[PDB]
Design an enzyme around this catalytic site. Structure first.
Site, short mmCIF file in Angstrom:
data_model
loop_
_atom_site.label_atom_id
_atom_site.label_comp_id
_atom_site.label_asym_id
_atom_site.label_seq_id
_atom_site.Cartn_x
_atom_site.Cartn_y
_atom_site.Cartn_z
N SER A 161 0.81 -1.22 0.00
CA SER A 161 0.00 0.00 0.00
C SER A 161 0.84 1.27 0.00
O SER A 161 0.32 2.37 -0.25
CB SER A 161 -0.95 0.01 1.20
C1 LIG Z 1 -1.72 -2.25 1.72
O1 LIG Z 1 -0.61 -2.69 2.05
C2 LIG Z 1 -2.94 -3.08 1.98
N1 LIG Z 1 -2.44 -4.37 2.36
C3 LIG Z 1 -3.09 -5.53 1.80
O2 LIG Z 1 -4.04 -5.44 1.07
C4 LIG Z 1 -2.54 -6.87 2.13
N2 LIG Z 1 -2.63 -7.59 0.89
C5 LIG Z 1 -1.63 -8.56 0.52
O3 LIG Z 1 -0.69 -8.81 1.27
N3 LIG Z 1 -1.80 -9.21 -0.79
C6 LIG Z 1 -0.81 -10.25 -1.19
C7 LIG Z 1 -0.87 -10.69 -2.69
N4 LIG Z 1 -2.11 -10.37 -3.40
C8 LIG Z 1 -2.22 -11.04 -4.69
C9 LIG Z 1 -0.92 -10.95 -5.46
C10 LIG Z 1 -3.09 -9.50 -2.90
O4 LIG Z 1 -4.11 -9.27 -3.56
C11 LIG Z 1 -2.91 -8.86 -1.61
O5 LIG Z 1 -3.73 -8.01 -1.24
C12 LIG Z 1 -3.19 -7.51 3.35
C13 LIG Z 1 -3.67 -8.81 3.34
C14 LIG Z 1 -4.23 -9.34 4.51
C15 LIG Z 1 -4.29 -8.55 5.66
O6 LIG Z 1 -4.85 -9.03 6.86
C16 LIG Z 1 -3.80 -7.26 5.66
C17 LIG Z 1 -3.24 -6.74 4.51
C18 LIG Z 1 -3.89 -2.39 2.96
N5 LIG Z 1 -3.09 -1.62 3.87
C19 LIG Z 1 -3.28 -1.56 5.30
C20 LIG Z 1 -2.27 -0.66 5.94
O7 LIG Z 1 -2.38 0.60 5.76
O8 LIG Z 1 -1.30 -1.13 6.63
C21 LIG Z 1 -4.59 -1.65 5.77
C22 LIG Z 1 -5.05 -0.92 7.02
C23 LIG Z 1 -5.65 -2.19 4.83
S1 LIG Z 1 -5.01 -3.50 3.78
#
Ligand SMILES: *C(=O)[C@@H](NC(=O)[C@H](NC(=O)N1CCN(CC)C(=O)C1=O)c1ccc(O)cc1)[C@@H]1N[C@@H](C(=O)O)[C@@H](C)CS1
Ligand SMILES: [Cl-]
Ligand SMILES: [Cl-]
Ligand SMILES: [Cl-]
Length: 514
Positions: free
Chosen positions: A244
């Site tokens: 993100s």
């Molecule tokens: C930004 O970092 C967001 N983080 C996520 O969406 C992640 N997602 C992933 O790790 N992945 C891995 C690989 N793929 C396919 C290639 C994905 O589609 C994907 O989304 C995530 C996953 C699970 C959990 O429990 C959390 C995060 C967003 N950013 C945060 C942040 O600001 O730290 C939050 C609050 C919302 S998710």
């Protein structure tokens, strides 16, 4: 009786931080050597000599007797100059001293990864020591000694060649910020039970790397039990999906495209978005529609996907390349990686999506900080430097002042707004930034692990006139949550507040100062 030629140890160049603080220094030491042939003619002096060297009388005696026919052996290496002449004062026949150098690292593990070390042969094998080895290495001198039949040194005949010292190297690092950064990252590693981490601080105006720390680390002054894992300058040589934390650049592409403006609202219901066999998922599924700013605040993958579909992958790829993600930094630090920005001919919907919210690409911590520095520097990118910079270099406008200015404002909102990333707030200052939380790649197969995460936070301050950018990365926290804004943001808060104070930056938000 012949003339032996012996080396005259040269001074290795001094490594300092940006202010002249010593990071690597050649300190004078004395080694004692002996001529067994001469020592054999003074056996009754042995017990005294053996005790001055802290060795067992018999074991010392054994040594000399086993080497009786020989003319040169080392007694002990690297004594202090005082310790040496203390023993030489005993006037034991066949005992000689050599004045030499040992490389000493005053900050030890605090700056081990940036600085690296020299090996037994005084050659740089890691870090800056390796990278600037030619510069730093001196050229040893030479002299001629006359010794007799029994190897007894008779006369210092002449110096055939003078020794020349290596040159002084001043790094861009501010040791004060490096101490602050090192201690805080260690604390967070331990609080969170994490496996590894990095922290990079960069001057946004000059490109100077002001601090670069990693855990695990090691003590270069004592490498006895060193494992290879602890040696890695992870900030430069390990690659990761930024997640993100690249959204502000995706958002920068959007605003530069003429197709979007901050007031636009995107419908992110139901918090998923099916495309093919793949499902784009939001973690915080609490809102139905978000404006541009709110897409960043809530970190909406669906939201950024829709903007991405509308603007196309090439504009996003373009901004990411331009801010330097997956590009050569030009620093030439040993083992440094460039990362990868995939280039496709046809960009399917999924790959356009995953690129826009930070997967499918890989960067280093230094690259990520560099990109945030450009954003903070009103869109002007400046070459990275790991050495002190006298003249502020000519930058390249990679993002227009206006887009940069707007995106700075949104990132400030990410920290300061309600439902924002409040643990990233910096006492006394307006801060801007963006968290990230990324599943780690599966060991031994394709895909992602369900329970291992990398926590990220990237940002800059003070918002009203940005001076420094910072990237905090923490791998596999397991003790007190895993989200970027829970784990890495409080580290950002603490280090940034200290850094700006140490640099005497005037507070721009007094109702929260101290
Ligand atoms: C930004 O970092 C967001 N983080 C996520 O969406 C992640 N997602 C992933 O790790 N992945 C891995 C690989 N793929 C396919 C290639 C994905 O589609 C994907 O989304 C995530 C996953 C699970 C959990 O429990 C959390 C995060 C967003 N950013 C945060 C942040 O600001 O730290 C939050 C609050 C919302 S998710
Ligand atoms: Cl590479
Ligand atoms: Cl440099
Ligand atoms: Cl990973």
């Amino acid at each position: 009786r012949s003339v032996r030629h012996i080396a005259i140890p040269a001074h290795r160049g001094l490594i300092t931080d940006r202010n002249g603080e010593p990071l690597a220094v050649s300190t004078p030491v004395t080694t004692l050597w002996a001529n067994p042939k001469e020592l054999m003619t003074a056996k009754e002096r042995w017990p005294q000599l053996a005790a001055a060297l802290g060795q067992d009388t018999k074991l010392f005696a054994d040594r000399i007797e086993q080497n009786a026919e020989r003319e040169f052996i080392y007694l002990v290496r690297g004594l202090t100059p005082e310790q040496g002449e203390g023993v030489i004062a005993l006037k034991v026949p066949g005992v000689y001293s050599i004045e030499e150098f040992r490389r000493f690292y005053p900050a030890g593990e605090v700056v081990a990864h940036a600085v690296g070390f020299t090996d037994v042969d005084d050659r740089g094998r890691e870090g800056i020591e390796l990278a600037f080895d030619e510069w730093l290495a001196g050229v040893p001198g030479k002299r001629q000694v006359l010794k007799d039949r029994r190897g007894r040194v008779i006369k210092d005949v002449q110096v055939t060649k003078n020794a020349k010292p290596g040159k002084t190297l001043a790094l861009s690092i501010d040791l004060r910020l490096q101490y602050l950064a090192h201690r805080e990252l260690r604390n967070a590693l331990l609080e969170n039970g994490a496996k590894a981490g990095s922290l990079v601080i960069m001057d946004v105006k000059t490109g100077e790397i002001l601090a670069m720390t990693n855990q695990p680390t090691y003590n270069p002054n004592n490498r006895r039990n060193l494992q290879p894992a602890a040696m890695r300058n992870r900030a430069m040589i390990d690659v990761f999906e930024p997640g993100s934390t690249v959204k502000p650049f995706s958002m920068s592409a959007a605003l530069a495209s003429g197709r979007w403006k901050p007031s636009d609202i995107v419908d992110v219901y139901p918090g998923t978005l099916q495309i093919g066999r793949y499902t784009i998922r939001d973690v915080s599924r609490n809102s139905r529609q978000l404006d541009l700013t709110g897409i960043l605040i809530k970190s909406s993958n669906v939201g950024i996907s829709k903007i991405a579909f509308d603007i196309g992958a090439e504009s996003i790829y373009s901004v990411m390349q331009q801010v330097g993600l997956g590009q050569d930094t030009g620093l030439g630090f040993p083992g440094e990686r460039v990362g990868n920005l995939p280039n496709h001919r046809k960009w399917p919907k999924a790959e356009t999506a995953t690129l826009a919210y930070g997967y499918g690409l890989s960067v280093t911590a230094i690259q990520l900080a560099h990109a945030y520095a450009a954003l903070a520097n009103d869109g002007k990118s400046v070459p990275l430097s790991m050495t002190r910079v006298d003249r502020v270099p000519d930058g390249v406008q990679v993002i227009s002042p206006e887009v940069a200015s707007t995106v700075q404002g949104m990132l400030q909102q990410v920290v300061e707004a309600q439902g924002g990333v409040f643990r990233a707030q910096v006492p006394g200052y307006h801060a801007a930034g963006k968290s990230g939380t990324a599943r780690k790649v599966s060991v031994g197969t394709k895909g992602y692990r369900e329970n291992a995460y990398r926590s990220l936070f990237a940002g800059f301050a003070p918002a009203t006139d940005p001076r420094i950018a910072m990237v905090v990365v923490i791998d596999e926290p397991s003790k007190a949550g895993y989200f970027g804004g829970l784990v890495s943001a409080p580290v950002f808060s603490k280090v940034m507040a200290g850094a700006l104070r140490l640099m005497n930056v005037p507070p721009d938000n007094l109702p929260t100062a101290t």
